[PDB]
Design a binder for this molecule. Structure first.
Ligand SMILES: C[C@H](CCC(=O)NCCC[N+](C)(C)C[C@H](O)CS(=O)(=O)O)[C@H]1CC[C@H]2[C@@H]3[C@H](O)C[C@@H]4C[C@H](O)CC[C@]4(C)[C@H]3C[C@H](O)[C@]12C
Ligand SMILES: C[C@H](CCC(=O)NCCC[N+](C)(C)C[C@H](O)CS(=O)(=O)O)[C@H]1CC[C@H]2[C@@H]3[C@H](O)C[C@@H]4C[C@H](O)CC[C@]4(C)[C@H]3C[C@H](O)[C@]12C
Ligand SMILES: [Mg+2]
Lengths: 1340, 551, 68
């Protein structure tokens, strides 16, 4: 069942798989992050409160002086949104903070204070976020793009390469905290264990073991397994554990209890082990040569003499065995080393350990951390015990603690933010386990180890960065001087916080200009995931492995949309349904699968849970009960895709198209193209300029509605009801009764955005779509914006295409275009530019904006008023005066013979110089709006007075009008109320509205609601008065500007760039092209009915680029326009309602087994006619992306029209008038227009300006500069015999500062001579080398 | 330099010299005072850190500027790709230049390029000034400047005069080899885009999807004579890498010629007798006979068997109508058998090469232009579309897939019973899917290339087909037999990022469309290919730079 | 190798244009060398006629005038 806004153009659909989930609100990531960042949070989980409670209170260094936190509040913005765009300042808000300074009493450290103070402190301004996730910073609209970064937590990464030519593998565990220092461990090619801190010089990892207050005995106790020997008064016998003999060949016959278990020479078999276990063998005598291979464990000193027999980590020799034997050391501790299980890496590292105690280790790490300086006891001890144990300099994270405890297999998910001893213990144990073999490596590209941080978290970090600086400053100031009784403001400082947050939002690597040339462009630029920026990598140091797709991208990141060229795989976009977890991992939905029944409940699944489960496929047919109708399903369990059974399914995919982005989901027949052309299509879709009259998609996906509504361009009704008055500027809604709050008077007023500019100069503009007195509902569109059409995204226009080669004019990729396209004015786009003219303050004096300029007649001065600024609505062209500005000139130092000429004529040169702003060459348009700013002290001129008067009258009129309509609605509601309980039907309109709000009634809530409406009226008039005063003061007050400037005039142009050979037009499947010619109507190929085809593409582009999707799109478009043509001809003569009913129903029932039963028995002869009228240009068709519309459905849809099933119809020829044999494909393809306009590219330079230090021309076309004659061009010219051309290519035309003037005189004198000279930049090189002691000189 | 609005821009050397002079002055003042030796030794070390001025950032660490960035010393003004050598002394920015988008414009002769009138008006400004002053149409040069500013109607004839025999230079950004820069005469265009002749897009490696080229102007007499003698387009028709021509007709014209020279087995008017190629032209355009029908014609071929003298020979060859139409293009000295076949792409390249090696250069360049003209004409007259019925799926495909599935099921059961090894089952599966893919490709090609069945005056006959994709592939006009079977047969076995091969290949074609899993498998290969084609460019450029600096 | 034999060149501007400039300049400076501008990189840098293409006759004339 469809709303009234959907009974206008109800789109025909083809999707087979019934979706069970609504597409979520497409910006919720950006909005929800910044909602977390700034919100009154009555606990320190996330937000500003988290930073404050993590950095406050502040204590002076036992000075009994406490500064502590209370709360914070966000102020009202001084300038709202459109004022911030007009003026140019950040849409910010003050951050008023309540802080408390308290000083404790003497010998009362925990005792009460002797003084308090509570002052509301202002600490900078944070920018705010508009209701589309965009910030306004300096007049512009900037977006901060979310970052993808390596997670805080442990990583048991291997090396896994050759990397030495040893053919070995190195397992280098690594710990990364969210704020702190790294702690790397790695093995060497000689398999010894090392350590390094913050990528410094290597150290053997025993140093930190000792520095954790551990001696050698406990180290060998923790990191090895003891082997105990018992001197049984002889033979040095050893006890047994039967597992210890696995995979070994004992040199003797293992025998006990008079029973042979293992033979000599025989290995200890598995059944030997089982027999040893069953027979309960404890202790045997061993040959004495077995113990000689051991390494002793602990310190067995001489108990008599107090001397050492053997320390820890000593290999034993038989004489030393006798020495411990004669000392009576019956119990001897050793180690269970091995070649397979228990590697002696700690033992050998202790052998290469050059330390002996804690102090040696701390001295060593102090030297390694900082060279040069002498070691010190307290400095080294404080450095080490502060580095990895401070809440200050080491915050692991909450998410870091979670992931660390998970990857360590420890149960508890929450713990400290600093590293304890047990954490390093278990990290060492697991690294040793991995080197032994029990354990598995991790990887980087797996999306379970990469988070998503958005504007909330980055803003919070920048705020903390400001706060630590201000806290250090306070701790400085609180220490010195006095107690004082001073007020808690002068030790605090606004600028070292606002500076930090403004340097983040103003120029980071993430805050960029929002491409604002399409609703799709804004949407796909707000949901962008970037791997660059701070905390990440750079494109010059990014290996191919992070650029690649990964099996954990299925439904969390789009694999097919990515910018190509310099950075592929770094700026991956986000999927359609892909949410974000609580911690910040990416999450995607799945439908719960019971025993065999698909339950339509939804469970969100993270990146690491998706492996242990089994996930079904969305293309699995099921029959009305959730049972899979097959006996198998193509699931995916751990990377692979294996044909599992009906019973082993745990989760089913949600919708068929959750693998793509939003930008790539608007491509019909995506499942046919090669991924290269799909990438190029989805990247060219976000560059289409909005045309003059946005038409439709004839063959669209079906998800244009959500993109149009969820982007901020269209104006969506907030409460349903009747529309009361529709201008082209405003829309007034009267709300329904049930949706009306009891408090206020309910009408709505929307104010549309008529003809303003965008960051790419295109003309963002809205127009209404509803009419007067027509019901709407909650959520309909009321005003289409740029590229929208009745709430559906329409990025271009759809035109009749034919695939045939045509006389070379579409040779490689060119696109022949008929004159009907330009004649119907259907690819015409509107641009809007901004021109600024400052009036600076020179030392010779101030410039003026007077109308009077020298040396110009009346042709230029016809279009300036008396003040000297161009009129509103003046058809200016290139090179014409807009802002007449003169500048003072000192003397000019007049010269010979023109001195004599001045003596002849006497027309003295003025002391002023013309420097007025004129229109840049090549453009032409109408001036739509003039903006004038001025410094406060300067007296304003006439035109500024006109503008201020007009703005003030407009503001007063609009505010008065808003109050008028609001009171009209309020009194109408009062009139409706007063009928109930004491009706004044004719009595009410007798008296005026003066005392209607005070009349008595039955003493109900409406009696004490007439007073509510009366107080609403009084509040409305008072609010009107105060807001009018505020607005008047805001208009009339001066505008703060840059230092040393007087006034700025901003003039707005509106070009109407039509279409020309050179423009780039693209399809949707990434078939680009440049228009080569614009033929007349008659020359175009026309089919048998006389209708000329409109665009003649090239067929050779299909079977080599393989994007076969565009041909099926062409066929389906031909079917759609066929049905539209049939219904148009049916509506041409007035036939009947029921005839249209019959045909429309039949057209809406194709083909077999689709959803969307859309029967027309519930439409009532007005909607039917409106539907038919809105359909007559062609019935729109939907195609969900991977669900698709199969070929036979297209065949039968074409057969519904009279068009041939083959899709190809014979085209005659325009010129000869004869017939093309081999009939050719025609049909309706949706074709875009990218904003690579030719006139923005084409530029030339005869002799422009020249660069200052090196006499070369300037950059590209902004300063009228020449081309870059690269090194390879010089190689090419050397390859030919061309010598003189090269000589003039790098001497006369560029750098020989006398040669070029001589060349100009020679050229205009009609004598193409040249005079070489020597290049200027070479002479600069001579001076640079000679600036050193390098005497270099030319000589002959 | 004084920036506007009271801002000052300076180089960092002012700061460095300030530092050195300051420390030197301080040391002078200390030596006046007879300071302690620790103070003067510290000051001399500071004066040593001269080192920053000469080459900052070599010894120790680099002192930084107010923006906390390592500032630039003299050695950074010399060295690097931003120093004088690579960036300012070898490659300069040039006056008299411009750039724009490019378009095709097949009406051009190949020694001339199209050029917009406005770019001509800007580039040739001083020539126009001189010509106007010489003709006495402006008294001074100032009046001439204001006259060309007003674009008054007599300036265009002056532009036409000074544009007459004046070459320009055209160049695209990756100038790999010496054909990257060529000369052209201009023909003025009432547009805004450079029209560039279609035959040299192969040499420029240029396609018209928005690519831009830069123009340069030779000024002096020696430079224009160089541009006409060496760099002119009609003097570079052979590649310097090898003697093969570089004016091969590329994709559309070769398709037109391939369609023009074939033979339907029974078309309108077969077996008549024609009395010369002019009769073939008349019989075609009147429509009484088809373009391709086997017709006994009479033709005369001239051979230069004598000492550089042509000798006529005329006979009754047995050819088609389209070939006899094409024969009016070939010049005198070529034997007739050069146009008596299907005329693919290697064939036409060899035809051009033979014409060059036998006749000379001028007839070969005129022959090249006539070939492009007639190729475009009959390609457009073909009407060679591409439709969804032009991708035939061989009907044995699903049976082959079913049999291969049976084989892989048997090997799966064998490894389930442990009779075989994991690498064994891997290679068994990979070989049976390879065999099935090969067999389905054989089935598709044998159903596509030859299935056309027409009947000459009798029962039945089979011929090569006109199934437009088969023409676009067999003719050589931008279509490979390995990029079919991704439109009809299975798409082979894609590879995982590790470099291995997936056990279950993608068995779906772009006509039937892939499902979600197959598409997600196919995505990785495209992304890896894109990244490699992006990162091969830097290595190739570096290799070229090394080679041209060693030789 | 080409990157090695492309640095043992008699000309030193042709060496300093393509490599780290510091080592080349210092070795040339202690050597007191004297480039003669014989190749192509030198004559491109100083911006006179290439001794290869059209300028070969001019350079042959200059050499003929030189030392004669
Ligand atoms: C308690 C809350 C969820 C409940 C479990 C935990 C789980 C993960 C925690 C966030 C992450 O650590 C990342 C980030 C680190 C910053 O330093 C402080 C802010 C952030 C957003 C943390 C706030 C909060 O602590 C989070 C949301
Ligand atoms: C009769 C109707 C109420 C019905 C009960 C009242 C209430 C809203 C009123 C319009 C609004 O004010 C907007 C607009 C302002 C213009 O400036 C003057 C005209 C407009 C159209 C007004 C005319 C009329 O007064 C309206 C329709
Ligand atoms: Mg290109």
């Amino acid at each position: 069942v469809y709303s009234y806004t959907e009974k206008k153009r109800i789109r025909k659909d083809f999707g087979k798989r019934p979706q069970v989930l609504d597409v979520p609100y497409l910006l919720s990531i950006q909005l929800d992050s910044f909602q977390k960042f700034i919100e009154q949070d009555p606990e320190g989980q996330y937000g500003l409160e988290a930073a404050f409670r993590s950095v406050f209170p502040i204590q002076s260094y036992s000075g009994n002086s406490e500064l502590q936190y209370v709360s914070y509040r966000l102020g009202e913005p001084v300038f709202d949104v459109q004022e911030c765009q007009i003026r140019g300042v950040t849409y910010s808000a003050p951050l008023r903070v309540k802080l408390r300074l308290v000083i404790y009493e003497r010998e009362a450290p925990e005792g009460t204070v002797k003084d308090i103070k509570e002052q509301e402190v202002y600490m900078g301004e944070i920018p705010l976020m508009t209701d589309n996730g965009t910030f306004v910073i300096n007049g512009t609209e900037r977006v901060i793009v979310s970052q993808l970064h390596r997670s805080p937590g442990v990583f048991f990464d291997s090396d896994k390469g050759k990397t030495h030519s040893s053919g070995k593998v190195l397992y280098n565990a690594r710990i990364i905290p969210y704020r702190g220092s790294w702690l790397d461990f790695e093995f060497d090619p000689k398999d010894n264990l090392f350590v390094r801190i913050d990528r410094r010089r290597k150290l053997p990892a025993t140093i930190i073991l000792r520095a954790l207050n551990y001696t050698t005995e406990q180290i060998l106790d923790l990191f090895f397994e003891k082997v105990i020997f018992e001197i049984r008064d002889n033979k040095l016998q050893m006890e047994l554990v039967p597992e210890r003999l696995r995979g070994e060949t004992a040199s003797f016959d293992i025998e006990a209890n008079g029973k042979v278990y293992v033979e000599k020479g025989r290995r200890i078999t598995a059944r030997h082990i089982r027999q040893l276990e069953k027979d309960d063998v404890k202790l045997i005598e061993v040959p004495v040569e077995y113990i000689a291979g051991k390494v002793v464990a602990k310190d067995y000193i001489d108990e008599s003499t107090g001397e050492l027999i053997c320390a820890a980590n000593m290999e034993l020799s038989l004489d030393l065995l006798a020495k411990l034997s004669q000392s009576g050391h019956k119990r001897i501790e050793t180690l269970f080393t091995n070649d397979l299980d228990h590697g002696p890496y700690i033992s050998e590292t202790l052998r290469v350990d050059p330390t002996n105690d804690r102090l040696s280790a701390l001295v060593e790490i102090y030297r390694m951390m900082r060279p040069g300086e002498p070691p010190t006891r307290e400095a080294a001890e404080s450095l080490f015990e502060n580095l990895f144990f401070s809440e200050d300099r080491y915050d692991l994270s909450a998410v870091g603690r979670m992931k660390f405890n998970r990857s360590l297999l420890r149960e508890e998910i929450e713990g400290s933010g600093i590293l304890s001893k047990d954490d390093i213990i278990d990290v060492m144990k697991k690294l040793i386990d991995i080197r032994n073999g029990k354990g598995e490596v991790d990887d980087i590209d797996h999306l379970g180890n990469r988070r998503i941080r958005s504007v909330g978290e980055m803003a919070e970090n920048q705020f903390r960065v400001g706060l630590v600086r201000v806290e250090r400053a306070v701790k400085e100031r609180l220490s010195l001087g006095d107690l004082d009784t001073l007020m808690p403001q002068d030790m605090i400082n606004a600028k070292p916080i606002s500076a930090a947050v403004k340097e983040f939002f103003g120029s980071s690597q993430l805050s960029q200009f929002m491409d604002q040339n399409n609703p799709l462009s804004e949407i796909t630029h707000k949901r962008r995931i970037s791997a660059l920026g701070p905390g990440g990598l750079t494109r010059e140091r990014a290996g191919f492995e992070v650029r690649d797709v990964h099996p954990t991208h299925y439904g969390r990141v789009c694999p097919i949309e990515t910018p190509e060229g310099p950075n592929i795989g770094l700026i991956n976009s986000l999927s359609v349904y892909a949410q974000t977890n609580e911690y910040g991992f990416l999450e995607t939905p799945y439908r719960k699968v019971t025993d065999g029944v698909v339950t339509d409940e939804i469970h969100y699944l993270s990146a690491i849970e998706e492996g242990n489960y089994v996930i079904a496929q969305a293309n699995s047919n099921l029959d009305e009960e959730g049972h899979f109708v097959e006996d198998l399903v193509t699931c995916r369990s751990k990377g692979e895709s294996s044909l599992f059974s009906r019973d082993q399914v745990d989760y089913m995919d949600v919708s068929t198209q959750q693998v793509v982005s939003v930008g790539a989901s608007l491509i019909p027949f995506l499942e046919h193209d090669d991924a290269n052309r799909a990438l190029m299509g989805a990247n060219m879709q976000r560059q289409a300029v909005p045309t003059l009259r946005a038409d439709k998609p004839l063959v669209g996906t079906g998800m244009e509605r959500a993109v149009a509504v969820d982007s901020g361009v269209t104006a969506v009704a907030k409460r349903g009801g009747v529309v009361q008055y529709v201008d082209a500027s405003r829309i007034v809604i009267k709300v329904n009764e049930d949706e009306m709050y009891p408090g206020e008077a309910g009408i709505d007023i929307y104010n549309l955005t008529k003809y303003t500019r965008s960051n790419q100069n295109t003309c963002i503009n809205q127009m209404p779509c509803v009419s007067l007195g027509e019901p709407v509902e909650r959520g309909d569109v009321l005003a289409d914006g740029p590229s929208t059409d009745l709430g559906e995204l329409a990025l271009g226009q759809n035109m009749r295409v034919a695939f045939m080669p045509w006389n070379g004019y579409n040779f490689e990729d060119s696109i022949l275009v008929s004159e009907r396209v330009v004649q119907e004015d259907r690819f015409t786009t509107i641009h809007i530019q901004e021109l600024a003219c400052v009036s600076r303050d020179t030392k010779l004096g101030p410039e003026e904006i007077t109308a009077d300029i020298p040396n110009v007649g009346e042709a230029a001065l016809s279009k300036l008023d008396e003040s000297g600024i161009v009129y509103i609505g003046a058809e200016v062209t290139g090179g014409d005066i807009l802002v007449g500005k003169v500048t003072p000139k000192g003397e000019t130092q007049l010269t010979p013979e023109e001195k004599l000429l001045r003596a002849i004529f006497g027309e003295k040169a003025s002391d002023v110089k013309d420097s007025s702003l004129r229109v840049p060459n090549g453009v032409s348009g109408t001036v739509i709006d003039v903006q004038v700013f001025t410094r406060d002290g300067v007296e304003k001129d006439k035109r500024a007075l006109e503008i201020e008067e007009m703005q003030l009258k407009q503001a007063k009129k609009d505010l008065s009008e808003e109050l008028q309509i609001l009171e009209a609605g309020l009194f109408s509601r009062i009139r409706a109320v007063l009928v109930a309980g004491g009706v004044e039907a004719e009595k009410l309109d007798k008296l005026p509205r003066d005392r209607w709000l005070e009349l008595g009634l039955t003493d109900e809530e409406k009696q004490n609601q007439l007073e509510q409406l009366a107080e609403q009226y009084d509040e409305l008039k008072h609010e009107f008065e105060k807001k009018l005063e505020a607005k008047r003061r805001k208009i009339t007050q001066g505008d703060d500007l840059a230092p040393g400037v007087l006034k700025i005039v901003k003039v707005y142009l509106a070009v109407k760039r039509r279409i020309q050979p050179g423009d780039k037009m693209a399809g949707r499947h990434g078939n680009k092209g440049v228009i080569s010619k614009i033929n007349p109507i008659e020359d175009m190929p026309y089919d048998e009915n006389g209708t000329p085809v409109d665009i003649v593409l090239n067929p050779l582009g299909v079977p080599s680029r393989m994007n076969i999707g565009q041909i099926l799109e062409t066929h389906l478009g031909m079917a759609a326009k066929g049905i539209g043509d049939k219904i148009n001809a049916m509506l041409k003569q007035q036939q009947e309602v029921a005839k249209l009913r019959e045909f429309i129903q039949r057209a809406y029932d194709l083909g077999a087994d689709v959803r969307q039963k859309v029967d027309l028995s519930t439409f009532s002869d007005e909607e039917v006619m409106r539907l038919a009228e809105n359909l007559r240009k062609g019935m729109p068709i939907a195609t969900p992306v991977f669900d698709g519309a199969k070929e036979a459905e297209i065949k039968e849809l074409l057969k519904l029209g009279d068009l041939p099933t083959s899709g190809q119809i014979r085209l005659y020829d325009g010129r000869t008038g004869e017939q093309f044999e081999r009939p050719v494909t025609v049909g309706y393809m949706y074709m875009l227009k990218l904003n690579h306009l030719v006139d923005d590219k084409m530029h030339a330079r005869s002799t422009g300006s020249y660069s200052l230090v090196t006499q070369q021309p300037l950059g590209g076309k902004a300063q009228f500069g020449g081309q870059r004659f690269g090194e390879m061009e010089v190689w090419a010219l050397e390859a030919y015999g061309a010598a003189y051309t090269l000589q003039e290519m790098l001497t006369v035309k560029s750098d020989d500062v006398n040669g070029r003037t001589k060349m100009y005189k020679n050229i205009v004198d009609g004598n193409h001579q040249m005079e070489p000279g020597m290049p200027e930049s070479f002479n600069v090189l001579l001076k640079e080398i000679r600036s050193l002691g390098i005497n270099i000189e030319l000589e002959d | 330099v004084p920036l506007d609005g009271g801002r000052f821009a300076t180089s960092d050397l002012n700061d460095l010299y300030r530092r050195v002079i300051n420390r030197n002055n301080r040391l002078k003042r200390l030596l006046d005072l007879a300071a302690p030796d620790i103070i003067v030794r510290n000051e001399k070390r500071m004066l040593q850190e001269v080192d920053a001025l000469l080459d900052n950032g070599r010894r120790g660490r680099a002192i930084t500027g107010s923006n906390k960035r390592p500032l630039k010393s003299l050695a950074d003004m010399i060295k690097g790709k931003q120093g004088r050598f690579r960036q300012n002394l070898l490659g300069k920015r040039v006056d008299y230049s411009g750039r724009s988008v490019i378009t095709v414009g097949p009406y051009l002769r190949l020694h001339q390029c199209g050029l917009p009138k406005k770019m001509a008006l800007e580039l040739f400004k001083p020539f126009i000034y001189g010509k106007l002053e010489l003709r006495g149409l402006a008294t001074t040069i100032k009046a001439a400047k204001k006259m060309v500013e007003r674009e008054e109607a007599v300036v265009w004839d002056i532009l036409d005069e000074v544009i007459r025999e004046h070459p320009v230079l055209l160049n695209r950004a990756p100038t790999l080899h010496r054909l990257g820069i060529q000369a052209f005469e201009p023909v003025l265009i009432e547009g805004k885009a450079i029209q560039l002749h279609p035959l040299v897009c192969a040499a420029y490696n240029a396609d018209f999807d928005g690519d831009q080229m830069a123009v340069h102007v030779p000024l002096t007499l020696e430079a224009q004579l160089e541009a006409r003698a060496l760099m002119m387009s009609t003097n570079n028709i052979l590649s310097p890498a090898n003697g093969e021509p570089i004016i091969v007709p590329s994709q559309d014209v070769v398709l037109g010629l391939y369609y023009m020279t074939r033979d339907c087995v029974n078309a309108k008017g077969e077996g008549m007798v024609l009395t010369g190629p002019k009769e073939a032209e008349r019989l075609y355009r009147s429509g009484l006979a088809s373009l391709h029908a086997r017709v006994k014609v009479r033709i005369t071929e001239y051979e230069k068997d004598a000492n550089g003298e042509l000798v006529a020979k005329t006979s009754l060859k047995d050819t088609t109508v389209g070939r006899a139409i094409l024969w009016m293009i070939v010049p005198k000295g070529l034997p007739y058998s050069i146009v008596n076949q299907a005329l693919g792409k290697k064939a036409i390249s060899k035809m051009l090469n033979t014409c060059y090696r036998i006749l000379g250069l001028k007839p070969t360049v005129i022959f090249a232009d006539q070939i492009m003209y007639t190729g475009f004409a009959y390609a457009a007259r073909s009407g060679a579309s591409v439709g969804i019925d032009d991708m035939v799926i061989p009907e044995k495909k699903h049976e082959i897939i079913s049999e291969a599935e049976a084989e892989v099921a048997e090997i799966q059961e064998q490894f389930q019973s442990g009779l075989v090894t994991a690498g064994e089952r891997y290679n068994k599966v990979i070989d049976i899917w390879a065999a099935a893919n090969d067999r389905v490709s054989k089935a598709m090609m044998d159903n596509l290339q030859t299935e056309t069945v027409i009947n000459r005056d009798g029962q039945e006959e089979k011929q090569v087909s006109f199934n437009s994709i088969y023409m676009m592939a067999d003719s050589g006009a931008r279509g490979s037999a390995a990029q079919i079977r991704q439109l009809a047969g299975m798409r082979g076995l894609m590879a995982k990022p590790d470099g291995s091969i997936i056990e279950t290949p993608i068995t779906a074609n772009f006509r039937e469309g892939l499902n979600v899993l197959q598409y997600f498998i196919s995505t990785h290969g495209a992304r890896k290919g894109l990244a490699d084609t992006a990162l091969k460019t830097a290595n190739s450029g570096y290799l070229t730079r090394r080679l041209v600096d060693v030789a | 190798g080409i990157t090695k034999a492309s640095l043992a060149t008699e000309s030193f501007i042709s060496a300093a244009s393509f490599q780290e400039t510091t080592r080349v300049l210092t070795e040339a400076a202690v050597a007191g060398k004297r480039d003669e501008l014989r190749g192509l990189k030198e004559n491109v840098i100083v911006g006179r006629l290439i001794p290869a293409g059209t300028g070969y006759a001019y350079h042959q004339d200059r050499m003929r005038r030189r030392a004669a």
